[PDB]
Symmetry: D2
Subunit: 727 residues, 4 copies
């Protein structure tokens, strides 16, 4: 009709902008100049809208899209309304099956580049030259919940990367912990059914705090290692940008000479490792169930591109049996103290999708999608995965032509004798649909294996043994890796692990299950077991108190790379601070605060008791982003309260609770001038305390001190003090 | 191995128990004596489990359900492992498309009976005799969120009842407010697209607090009435047991003489009308996203059967 | 590799060639320069093959496409063989549901152009200017059989045309007879279930000669008119090029002023009308079940493009009730004597598809796909079709995005707010997926109806009546159209109709059904009824002999336009002649024969008792196309036997049978010189018979006689003589 | 899976076993069987681990593959004995 505002404020600027400054938008409209080969190849299917007539799917222009055709304006609708029937028919068939696992996920486009050629250890084309850029599409996810479940649940997270290489698609389908819960793919349906909502009533949705999960765990000790990681703060990441990524399985690299090297894949977050605390994560599933999806999208729109370093743990074929654990066991990690991660390249995610359903929901990743230069191993969990992803995409994506859905298409050539199937897009002109043929001179043709652009050939691994359904005896050790993880955590990380087990088992209705889990914990570490038991009102027996701890892993009694926080890796860029306004803010404090945050790439959100604007002491009009209740402290990393007419918000329950919540969740808080009146809300002593910044104004070192606290992420020393606090 | 506790505490007692007293269970095991014609008719497809051997879907007993078949215990998995492939194939194909709208819902079985014969206004068989009972199956739901979204969001709620009558299935597919947002079905895709997660990023999930919804509302004043109900405490019911139900449309009742009477259908909650407050409702989507589903199930397990007039 | 022959004889020349001269091939390879806007728009999905490496669908080059991966060369196949699994998975999912009806069909691309602007009667853009060329895709089909059934069965034929216009796709979905079997769409499932294979045993496949069809017919007299057409030679066309096409229903044309004109659509074959005879057609289902598909394909490859004239029967709105039948009744035809067909344009089919499955199998036609300038009527059969085609395509083509399958895509712009669905190709960038919207300034926008490029608005027909499930009393007349059809046929056409009913009813096992059908025929015409009755061993009763014939149609006692042959319209171009060779052929005969055929565009097939070649009297080496048994007389239009060493073939059983079969099927036979020794096998008098060309040599007079016979298609005067030929 | 519309094609009447069939598989398009087991996984304690595995034996035992000896490298090669 012409319904947009004449000022053009319905449309976001096509330039990098901070979270909340403009409405978010499709990637190609928000950043039209951010391109890569894959993004450019999708131009054939992108559809615009501006200045076009509204039509049916057959191209017929529609005159009235407000009404059905009827016999009289109050009469019955007629069967001959083909416009109504096409529109409703398409609507009626919009949904497709969600993924069986990892249904909840958020994705973005980006690119990868190796630091140097890895030709000496692999012939993979995408790793052969530092100037070779490979477009990527990455999807992060949770495991259990449906597509409509919440983001900040306690769960393992998926980290899947599709590399569009010149020699084929390579999908690296990993998680955010270095091991999996189970050893053999044959138990995947059992484990997944145990973690998912219980079958009679379909509860609970995205959390593992229920009887069937802990029943399975208690009866299958192989799960304890990954359960330890999920109960730690690893299970509640602050953002997809601040978690690690792992392929889990041992794969192989194959070089041009035919030599195989064992490899485990790693992704290191260049923004550092950071997680939430349980109460904050659980409350955030209610205040904003889309927090991680939102944060990823807004980081990219702001220019705070998620960056990750690809790394390899490499083990020579002759060292296969030199560890206490089997390299093919996916419940075991390879300590970085024994085998370092070698840096390989960098991945930058710099553009959001245009349409979530077309690009994210329909993307199909599969660990079997490898390229020459890579190969599999006999890890029995990996072996079963190779069957499952192909199979599940036939029904999820409606047929065998899912590789023709635009996001899944290779950017390199694909030619073969496969034909037909539902939704066939490619129109083959080859006279032949078989080989060998003479009628097309046998094209397309097979290609011998070689150093570059050669055909795929499997590494000739020797196989020897009888046909058996048997777990290798080398996989039968379940407590030493869990113990190594436990001993590598800081004291506050250990407390959070204890609290995770304690909360989860408290939701298990059958008390004997809680007792059996405590007994398993007694096989890992007596301190851990006793602290969980205490929280459950359970007493360890004398036998449990005397269980001898499992052996160290290859002489290691700790590995600091397993901790999130033992070695500081803080990065403040992309973080956000809430600024609690009053109706006569001291403009000088605000100028100093906002420019200091801007200089470090830290975002700010100006909050108040209502929307609109407030006027500072000098007449500056300040736009309000959200109310105190509308953008709770759960969504920010720190809180700053500038001076001004503090009496305006001093008795506001929401403003005081904002600080109590932030205080409880260990976030840095800074109070300027009369905002120090809020110290009584959080019980801060006159002399102050570490973790609370306070001064007469926001000048001098006030912002440097607050930013130092932000770099350390949370104020772990406040734990004992938050214990009380009614919040 | 891995077996039940000696004391039998793994299994819920098959008698009415208050919420949290026992682990919840499948209806036919929790209340085996509760029957109706429809519940009995489902006996042909009910499948037990106790004392039976684990098998493939073709009826072959399985000896080892813990391991794939491999060439040596540290070897590659073999293509001939049909037990593994059947089990994983079925798992791989478990999901079906969720409902386009009202994907989040909770249901139960029950029965209906009229207070007196209504043959003077309708010849419908299920309303003809006070002592002729009709089995029902009811599903309550939200509108916008997916099947894995939260229960206590601010939304219209669906209230759908399937009556298994002697003259055919009658479905009364209503909501918890007496009007709908739009006037003509041709606009349904537009309204639903506007309230659902925005197309670029698929946010937000089960709440209408976002630009596209309010853009549509502001441009289509016919939506204001149902928007008023949604913004009131009607949009955040305490329980599915404590909300009203409406068919919304005017339908017709036809008697034996051929006379038509216009009718609008209502459900009155015999537990009364009650709603949460916003802050409570929003925090509860995080503390227990399955609150309404749980509360309905536990009320029926306790004998606090949802009753509607 | 190099499996192709070094002489390059594996590839067909990319130039027009006669049937059997070269191997057939994909359309874009056979005629690369035949183009139209639709064919050009399909170039984005056309996939080549020459000089490309064989890959997986993910782009990974394959080294060995001959073997599975196994542990040892006689060992078990490994689950990690992802190349094998992808290839077998695609193969396992190649098939999609066939069409519910008209599953057996053959299609080609072409173009349409009007003869003049029709803007005075319609605002349809494709009919607005003679220089407007509209690409078309046409599919011809049978009704009953599956996709693998035979072509030359006795059945109604489908004739569906997709017009890719500038204002949207218009699908004219018609049949080869001017009426349908039933009046209301509610009965379609009943009629179709009655004609299809019976449910217990799924017999018979593509013929209606079974109990359930004739049971339904006998109980539903409205079916008799279309049954009359199916039992005539109209039910066994010689080729899709030699049959008429009809839209059947009365539709409306709408002009720029808003005036509606009733219209019935017609397709007139420019190659003329021609049909087989029953014995030939039935035997042809066994010798070549793909005869019509092959003939269409080879005519296009030879440059014998199928050409049809589009024609309109136009009736003013005020003449709605001027006939003695209802214009909305689809079991009633509009006699051309009463309302002439106005010749409006010409369609030419000039290119075969590249891939049958991608283009033909996946094509989706729907009669509800109309454009501004056209509109529906209340015909109750057409009304229910409007619902059916949209619904069936959801499952047949896997979802609501079937319009994105290449062959179905409009060539004109399409933009709307519809999103998602299985196999969504288009990536929408519109910020909005609803209207009205302000966020994209309400685009795409509605367009008011207008003279050109306007939105679709329904003609505002007045509707008055109660909601009823009732047949109009005006449709309650079943015998006058069947009678008009019968009386318009030639005597031999009438004989063929009698024989059609007689053969079919003889295969009905329950005798009472045959009797009930004969009773219905007595309500149409006594002569027809008696002749069928006599063949069934039935005696008409006293009462049946006195049934008063139905009234004439608006004063007509016949209309020659309903006859295939009453009015001469034969065309020999594209027809084919069998030439029976001997080991020492009189080369002078062959030269004269071939030169004369070539001048008329008639093809030849040189046949012998073995493959290879023979040598003529003068030394000319003649290449044999097929054997006598290999290419039976059923596949040709006439037979010529040149002189030479007849002793070589005079005792050949197959040679003699070839002439007996052609003689029985009323085909022109020409015998030169000593080839006149074959007159004894078909018992022709010494003085000759009309239909048999004979002479001392194959001169110009001999060839003109034969081509004159060919122009009349068959020798109808020979019917009384074939009774005594054991063939 | 595609021909018969999902993973429950064994529930189509002609395909159904006449002997008992019990396991932890659930859901899928056109699911007929309504499982009452409290558990949909094994090992479980909540249904005392039923339905349970059955050792191989002379009659009514679980399926166990014959322990054939496998030896060789992982190859895509036709055995020379087949040529
Ligand atoms: C090391 C252990 C595993 C890891 C790290 C892993 C990781 C993942 C990830 C990240 C996804 C989501 C990909 C996306 O974003 O679309 C996924 C999906 C999936 N996983 Fe795995 N997974 C593991 C084990 C397994 C096993 C053992 C099976 C079955 C044998 C399995 C079956 C599936 C299926 C069927 C899907 C859905 C794929 C689709 O619908 O496209 N996973 N997994
Ligand atoms: C008075 C207005 C309406 C009411 C009260 C209503 C109510 C409902 C309810 C309660 C459900 C869920 C039933 C269940 O629990 O499975 C539902 C589902 C659905 N509704 Fe309606 N609705 C209304 C308007 C519409 C309109 C106008 C359309 C489209 C023209 C529509 C299309 C659908 C569809 C497609 C489903 C999914 C059903 C399925 O997948 O089985 N609804 N509706
Ligand atoms: C005048 C009467 C009719 C004519 C001339 C006609 C003609 C045709 C033709 C030519 C086709 C095949 C199109 C192609 O080649 O793909 C077809 C298919 C079909 N017809 Fe009709 N038909 C008629 C009546 C009906 C009726 C009354 C119905 C149901 C109410 C119906 C339902 C169908 C369906 C479901 C298909 C398959 C479409 C697809 O799978 O794409 N037909 N018809």
């Amino acid at each position: 009709d012409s319904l947009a505002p004449e000022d053009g404020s319905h449309r976001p600027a096509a330039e990098p902008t901070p979270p909340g400054a403009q409405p978010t938008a499709p990637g190609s409209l928000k950043a039209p100049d951010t391109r890569n080969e894959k993004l450019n190849s999708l131009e054939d299917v992108r559809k615009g809208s501006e200045n076009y007539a509204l039509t049916t799917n057959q191209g017929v222009r529609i005159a009235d899209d407000q009404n059905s055709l009827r016999a009289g304006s109050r009469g019955p609708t007629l069967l001959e309304d083909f416009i109504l029937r096409e529109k409703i028919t398409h609507f009626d068939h919009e949904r497709i099956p969600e993924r069986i696992v990892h249904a909840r996920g958020s994705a973005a486009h980006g690119y990868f580049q190796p630091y140097k050629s890895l030709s000496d250890i692999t012939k993979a084309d995408f790793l052969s030259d530092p100037n070779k850029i490979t477009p990527v599409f990455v999807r992060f996810s949770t495991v259990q919940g449906g597509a409509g479940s919440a983001d900040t649940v306690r769960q393992i997270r998926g980290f899947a990367t599709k590399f569009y290489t010149e020699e084929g698609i390579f999908d690296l389908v990993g998680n955010n912990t270095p091991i999996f819960f189970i050893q053999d793919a044959h138990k995947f349906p059992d484990f997944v059914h145990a973690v998912k909502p219980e079958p009679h009533w379909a509860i609970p949705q995205g959390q593992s705090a229920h009887d069937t999960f802990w029943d399975y765990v208690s009866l299958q000790p192989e799960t304890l290692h990954n359960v330890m990681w999920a109960m730690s703060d690893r299970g509640i990441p602050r953002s997809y940008r601040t978690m690690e990524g792992f392929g889990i399985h041992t794969f192989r690299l194959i070089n041009a000479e035919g030599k195989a090297t064992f490899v485990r894949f790693h992704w290191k977050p260049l923004a550092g490792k950071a997680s939430l605390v349980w109460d904050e994560a659980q409350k955030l599933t209610g205040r904003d169930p889309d927090f991680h999806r939102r944060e990823l999208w807004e980081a990219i729109e702001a220019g705070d591109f998620p960056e990750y370093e690809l790394g390899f743990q490499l083990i020579p074929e002759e060292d296969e049996f030199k560890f206490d654990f089997d390299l093919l066991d996916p419940t075991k990690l390879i300590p970085e103290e024994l085998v370092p991660v070698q840096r390989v390249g960098k991945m930058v995610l710099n553009r959001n999708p245009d349409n979530f359903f077309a690009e994210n929901e329909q993307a199909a990743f599969h660990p079997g999608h490898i390229v020459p230069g890579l190969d599999f191993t006999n890890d029995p969990l990996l072996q079963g995965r190779l069957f499952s992803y192909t199979d599940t995409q036939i029904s999820r994506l409606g047929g065998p032509n899912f590789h023709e859905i635009p996001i899944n298409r290779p950017t390199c050539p694909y030619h073969n004798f496969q034909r037909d199937g539902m939704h066939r897009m490619g129109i083959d002109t080859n006279p032949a649909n078989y080989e060998p043929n003479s009628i097309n001179d046998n094209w397309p043709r097979e290609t011998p294996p070689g150093p570059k652009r050669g055909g795929f050939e499997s590494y000739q691994e020797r196989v020897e043994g009888n046909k058996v359904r048997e777990r290798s005896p080398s996989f039968g050790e379940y407590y030493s890796h869990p113990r190594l993880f436990w001993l590598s955590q800081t004291p506050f990380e250990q407390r959070h692990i204890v609290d995770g087990f304690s909360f989860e088992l408290s939701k298990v209705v059958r008390p004997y299950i809680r007792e059996r889990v405590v007994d398993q914990l007694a096989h890992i570490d007596l301190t851990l077991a006793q602290a969980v038991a205490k929280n459950l009102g359970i007493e360890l027996t004398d036998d449990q108190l005397n269980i001898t701890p499992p052996p160290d892993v290859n002489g290691l009694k700790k590995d600091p790379s397993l901790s999130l926080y033992a070695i500081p890796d803080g990065d403040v860029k992309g973080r956000v601070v809430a600024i609690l306004l009053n109706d006569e803010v001291r403009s000088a404090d605000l100028l100093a605060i906002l420019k200091a945050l801007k200089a470090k790439g830290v975002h700010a959100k100006l909050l108040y008791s209502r929307m609109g604007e407030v006027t500072a002491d000098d007449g500056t009009v300040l736009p309000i982003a959200a109310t105190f209740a509308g953008a709770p402290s759960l969504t920010v990393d720190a809180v700053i309260v500038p001076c001004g007419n503090i009496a305006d918000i001093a008795d506001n329950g929401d403003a005081n609770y904002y600080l109590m919540e932030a205080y409880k969740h260990l976030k840095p808080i800074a109070l300027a001038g009369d905002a120090r009146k809020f110290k009584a809300t959080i019980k801060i002593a006159d002399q102050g305390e570490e973790g609370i910044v306070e001064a007469d104004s926001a000048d001098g070192s006030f912002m440097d001190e607050l930013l130092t606290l932000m770099a350390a992420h949370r104020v772990w020393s406040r734990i004992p003090k938050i214990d009380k606090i009614p919040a």
